[PDB]
Amino acid sequence: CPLMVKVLDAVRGSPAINVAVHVFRKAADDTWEPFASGKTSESGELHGLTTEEEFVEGIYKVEIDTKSYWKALGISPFHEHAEVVFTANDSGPRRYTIAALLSPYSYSTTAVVTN
Amino acid sequence: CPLMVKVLDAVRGSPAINVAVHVFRKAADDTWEPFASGKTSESGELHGLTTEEEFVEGIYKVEIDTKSYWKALGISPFHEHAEVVFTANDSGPRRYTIAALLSPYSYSTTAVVTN
Amino acid sequence: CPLMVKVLDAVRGSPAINVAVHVFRKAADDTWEPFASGKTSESGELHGLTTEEEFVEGIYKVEIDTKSYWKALGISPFHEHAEVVFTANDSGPRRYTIAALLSPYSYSTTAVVTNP
Amino acid sequence: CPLMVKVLDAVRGSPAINVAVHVFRKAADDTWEPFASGKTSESGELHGLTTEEEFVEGIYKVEIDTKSYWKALGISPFHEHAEVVFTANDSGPRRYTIAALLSPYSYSTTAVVTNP
Ligand SMILES: O=C(O)c1cc(-c2ccc(F)cc2F)cc(I)c1O
Ligand SMILES: O=C(O)c1cc(-c2ccc(F)cc2F)cc(I)c1O
């Protein structure tokens, strides 16, 4: 409930469906440890990645597999994937939404943090 | 239900609340006639602008009063407002979401059309 | 020049070439008066729209004709055009770059404003 | 040059100056090897990172140090950095411009790819 991911398609004007998303947490030795993953729904959303109990302060990476998404549509893309890296802080609001708007040679990403 | 507007703030990482939004429809004589309006909610959303019965094919303009939003926050903005102009077509999906992501000197806008 | 427009294509990863651009200025009577127009070059840039002398204080609208652009590529896009409306030169002369990044159902626009 | 990076500030309406940028290339062993680095100029541009000879086929990562940028302006931003990962030169040499538009809680990036 603390972390949700939403992906939109700027070519078709639609949610980006069945996009793979991987989340990692930074470990003591500076490597990225798998944390959570899933595929976006028909609404372009990925819910249920983690819980309040598990989502402690730390540095997290969200990797969105944009290349496979475009290839499935028959479109040649530029990026291998989209990556969003951020620090989770207990000071700020409690719910994080990471959103990405996708085009073949561009993407935009923003965070909405509420509560 | 056919038309919803969502506004986000890229400086604060939050919904853009209490932003004025005006919708117009293009008339026969080429002028813009008021159609619907409102202010975004605490979630940054504006629901209930129109009905399926009233939202006929035509050219529509959505004007978002970004200047007043930034001025209320004490921030000097570039744009007078953000404007989104589009044709509604019965061919395509039935529900239109117009989203805008706001910064003082930039904005991005996208449309999600579903069903 | 004091006003330049740059347009990029996010589907192709290229400048958006031959895009029509019309500029208007709000008149004393509150109507939009034609001010300048042109088309983007092979670099996606449009220079020479105006001069420091002619580009006085006022509210300006830069209308970028994205629909025509996309239709010629075989795409039926969402927007009729992209419109950028701003006050210019109200604290003295500035140089303005208006940039737009285009996709079929989305666009992003930003401005870079410098002082000579 | 075959690889240029441009960075803009959406809060100020200006080039983003003195932004650190690090480039890496994926090694045969699947690790990220340092490839080039630099900082943006007063124009927000970073030129001279590499040459056509050195910029061979491979997977590259361009890491833009946005957090440090924002903190010096008194803003605590959301992202640690902005990272752009792409395959380059796999159909022969190309010229790449990587552009990034920055806000405290958002960034947009695009690429323009041309053939000389
Ligand atoms: O629900 C959302 O969070 C949402 C977000 C966007 C959006 C995403 C990235 C961006 F740069 C601009 C946007 F409007 C666009 C739409 I349409 C959205 O619905
Ligand atoms: O010269 C440029 O490459 C340039 C690019 C942008 C820009 C950058 C990223 C983006 F997502 C959208 C833009 F318009 C904005 C401006 I103003 C530019 O001048």
Helices vs strands, H then E, count in chain A:
1, 9
CA C32-C34-C37 angle, 5° bins: 135
Q: Which helix (H) or strand (E) holds C71?
A: helix C66-71
Distance of CA C18 to the CA centre of its chain: 13
- With 0-12 / 13-18 / 19 or more C-beta atoms within 10 angstroms meaning exposed / middle / buried, residue D31 is exposed
Pair type for strands B20-26 and B32-39? antiparallel
A71 close to A79: Cβ distance less than 8 angstroms: no
Ligand 2 centroid, distance to A113 Cα (angstroms): 26
D116 touches chain C (CB under 8 A): no
How many angstroms separate the CA atoms of C87 and C104, rounded?
Answer: 28
Q: Which residue has the tokens 């140090």?
A: D65
Residues from chain C contacting residue A104 (CB–CB below 8 Å): 10-13
Ligand 1 centroid, distance to C51 Cα (angstroms): 37
| Distances, alpha carbon D88 to alpha carbons A71, B32, D26, in Å | 17, 48, 11
D112 touches chain C (CB under 8 A): yes
Q: Which of B115, B95, B100 is nearest to B2 (CA)?
A: B95
Q: Does the CB atom of residue B106 touch ligand 1 within 6 A?
A: no
Q: Which residues pair with C102 in a beta bridge?
A: C9, C107
Q: Does the CB atom of residue A14 touch ligand 1 within 6 A?
A: no
How many angstroms separate the CA atoms of D91 and A79, rounded?
Answer: 16
A78 close to A104: Cβ distance less than 8 angstroms: yes
CA dihedral D9, D13, D17, D22 (to 10 degrees): 20
How many angstroms separate the CA atoms of D17 and A26, rounded?
Answer: 29
Containing structural domain, residue C2: 1-116
CA A60-A61-A65 angle, 5° bins: 155
Number of independent structural domains in chain B: 1
Q: Show Cβ contacts of residue A67 under 8 Å, excluding neighbours closer than 6 positions.
A: A77, A79, A80, A81
A52 close to A1: Cβ distance less than 8 angstroms: yes
Q: How many CB atoms neighbour CB B11 within 10 A?
A: 20
Is the CB of A103 less than 8 angstroms away from the CB of C108? no
DSSP labels for B55-93?
Answer: --SEEEEEEE-HHHHHHHTT---SEEEEEEEEEE-SSS-
B110 touches chain A (CB under 8 A): yes
A17 close to A54: Cβ distance less than 8 angstroms: no
How many angstroms separate the CA atoms of B62 and B98, rounded?
Answer: 9
CA A104-C112-A111 angle, 5° bins: 50
How many angstroms separate the CA atoms of B66 and B81, rounded?
Answer: 5
Q: Show Cβ contacts of residue D75 under 8 Å, excluding neighbours closer than 6 positions.
A: D11, D104
Q: Which helix (H) or strand (E) holds C66?
A: helix C66-71
Q: Which helix (H) or strand (E) holds A72?
A: helix A66-72
Rounded to a whole number of angstroms, the distance from the CA of A84 to the nearest CA of chain C is: 19
- Check which CATH number belongs to the domain holding B108 and give it: 2.60.40.180
